[PDB]
# Entry
Amino acid sequence: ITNLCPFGEVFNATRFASVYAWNRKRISNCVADYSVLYNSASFSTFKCYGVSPTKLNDLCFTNVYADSFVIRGDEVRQIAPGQTGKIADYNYKLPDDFTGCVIAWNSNNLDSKVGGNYNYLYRLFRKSNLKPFERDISTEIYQAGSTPCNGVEGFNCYFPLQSYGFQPTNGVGYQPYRVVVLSFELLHAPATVCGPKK
Amino acid sequence: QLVLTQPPSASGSPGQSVTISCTGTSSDVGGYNYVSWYQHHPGKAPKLMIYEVSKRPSGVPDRFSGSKSGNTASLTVSGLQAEDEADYYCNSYAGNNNWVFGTGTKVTVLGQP
Amino acid sequence: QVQLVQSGAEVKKPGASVTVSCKASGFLFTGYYMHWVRQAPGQGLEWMGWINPNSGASNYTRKFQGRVTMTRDTSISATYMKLSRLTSDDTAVYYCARDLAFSMVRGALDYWGQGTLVTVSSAS
Ligand SMILES: *[C@@H]1O[C@H](CO[C@@H]2O[C@@H](C)[C@@H](O)[C@@H](O)[C@@H]2O)[C@@H](O[C@@H]2O[C@H](CO)[C@@H](O[C@@H]3O[C@H](CO[C@H]4O[C@H](CO)[C@@H](O)[C@H](O)[C@@H]4O)[C@@H](O)[C@H](O[C@H]4O[C@H](CO)[C@@H](O)[C@H](O)[C@@H]4O)[C@@H]3O)[C@H](O)[C@H]2NC(C)=O)[C@H](O)[C@H]1NC(C)=O
Ligand SMILES: *[C@@H]1O[C@H](CO)[C@@H](O[C@@H]2O[C@H](CO)[C@@H](O)[C@H](O)[C@H]2NC(C)=O)[C@H](O)[C@H]1NC(C)=O
# Structure
């Protein structure tokens, strides 16, 4: 096999996504070279769980899943297994048995506007915590209190989504951060995606 | 249409305390604990004196104190001084996603040299 | 610091439409509900309506139902209010106020605009 895994379509896309509606891409039947990844000298965070971030280009995986986000910098630590917070349980939940790698880099030069970038959203209110690897794109009105909310927002009926509204003047903890999560699977099935060996 | 009743006017010499009462139906003031008080000067936009029922936004002094009992809210101003001449309004939630303002009270410092 | 700027004073003939704008700066535009209030000459304050600058939802009082429409424009961070079918009893000063709570509506109007004077009359 000689196909090259399409990391460019996910690591260099113009606009990635909103956190609450993160898109997932299935990488399989291809050859992935990780030299460009861990030796880019541009990723602020390259935290690998369950695998050594240096020898990941020599063991073969059954398939890979690439997930994208644009989040707030100070919230990046919430994208680790076990950690909980505002986006770790209402927007994106990682299983405690994770075996992937979380990559994150600051992108205030592409995902910020002087007036304000009200184009990236995250879920603020939800009835219960998200299950591991679950999406929730429904915009149903969050019924707080006791009186039913018949579909019209107002008093005691909140709108679940909220906007980050990035600006190119906030601190490093309030600037955009592009995040890519690579989930592997060390199953017993015959592997089909992995880096060049011989 | 619903209306919140307030006294036509209130007065007090500089130094003592004055009180303003805002009365409404049980579904306006008694039903919910959201009764804010605003101060309005001539030629300036109204300023939020207190919100919720007793909380004070940052900036206002300790003179203003609000409290609600039964179906009537009340705002008390202590240490009244000459700069308190203004119209005070009570805003309350009235159900069906609607807020209602009171008629307002024009507070007069009485003793002016 | 925050800042809300309204459109200039307007004069309209009876039976027309007035579009008053409120531009917000210095804070997260979407996340604080906006309220529109009115004060007629010597009549005290009067709460008109409520608009959400995030989802575009809004609600009014039965008095103004069918006459007032509120819109948002997050591209320039502005809130527009359109009052149609004016009458001599509508000349007043209109204020746009920012709610206090975050992503919720509670009626605490901490920050206020400057007030736009709208006058309706048959004169020039
Ligand atoms: C602005 O807010 C208004 C008030 O909203 C209330 O407060 C919020 C916080 C929530 O609690 C909300 O549930 C409250 O209604 C809002 O007005 C409300 O609008 C909804 C839907 O738009 C109405 O629900 C419908 O009610 C009718 C019956 O109406 C009765 O009440 C009115 C008012 O008292 C009377 O005039 C009538 O004669 C009736 O007695 C139901 O028949 C209907 O259900 C049927 O239809 C739906 C949809 O087809 C079906 O799914 C059902 O199975 C039924 O077949 C709805 O339930 C609500 O009555 C109305 N209340 C009031 C007081 O106006 C207004 O819409 C908001 N405006 C905006 C957002 O622009
Ligand atoms: C994604 O873009 C990056 C750069 O934006 C690519 O990385 C290298 O970038 C330098 C210049 O910064 C180029 O000279 C190289 O040709 C790029 N490639 C390599 C392998 O060094 C990167 O290749 C792009 N694709 C991926 C999957 O990251």
Notes: The beta strands of chain A are 24-27, 45-48, 64-72, 100-106, 121-123, 142-143, 157-158, 161-163, 176-183.
